Amino acid sequence: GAMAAATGMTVTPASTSVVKGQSTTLTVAFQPEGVTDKSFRAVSADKTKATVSVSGMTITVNGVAAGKVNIPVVSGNGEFAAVAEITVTAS
């Protein structure tokens, strides 16, 4: 409850398309300069046509079904955030 997210988080997703059955990887960066603590996290916006798994500042996105799936990001209590999109080809 009582914590601090950070003082500057730079998330750089894949932002691109993918083939059915494939998956991409998103990168996350943080430069608080005083906090030094992973208080942020990732999550799928739909999770109905793609999976997501964050780990070590690396979030892998799988294209279960064809379509565009967004993947937002929350830091602390809403301090910082990010947005990404992964297209899935029916083929």
Q: Do the bridges between strand 16-19 and strand 85-89 make them parallel or antiparallel, or are there none, so unpaired? A: parallel
Q: Which domains does the chain have, with CATH numbers?
A: 1-91 (2.60.40.1080)
- Kind and range of the H or E element at 88? strand 85-89
Q: Give the C-alpha separation, 82 to 89, whole Å.
A: 24
Dihedral angle sign, alpha carbons of residues 63, 65, 70, 72: negative
The sign of the dihedral angle between the CA atoms of 52, 56, 30, 7 is positive
The answer to whether 14 and 26 are in contact (CB under 8 A) is yes
User: For residues 23 and 3, what is the distance between their CA atoms, to the nearest angstrom?
Assistant: 33
Cα distances (Å, whole numbers) of residue 45 to 1, 34, 56: 24, 30, 20
Spatial separation of the C-alpha atoms in residues 12 and 27, rounded to whole Å: 5
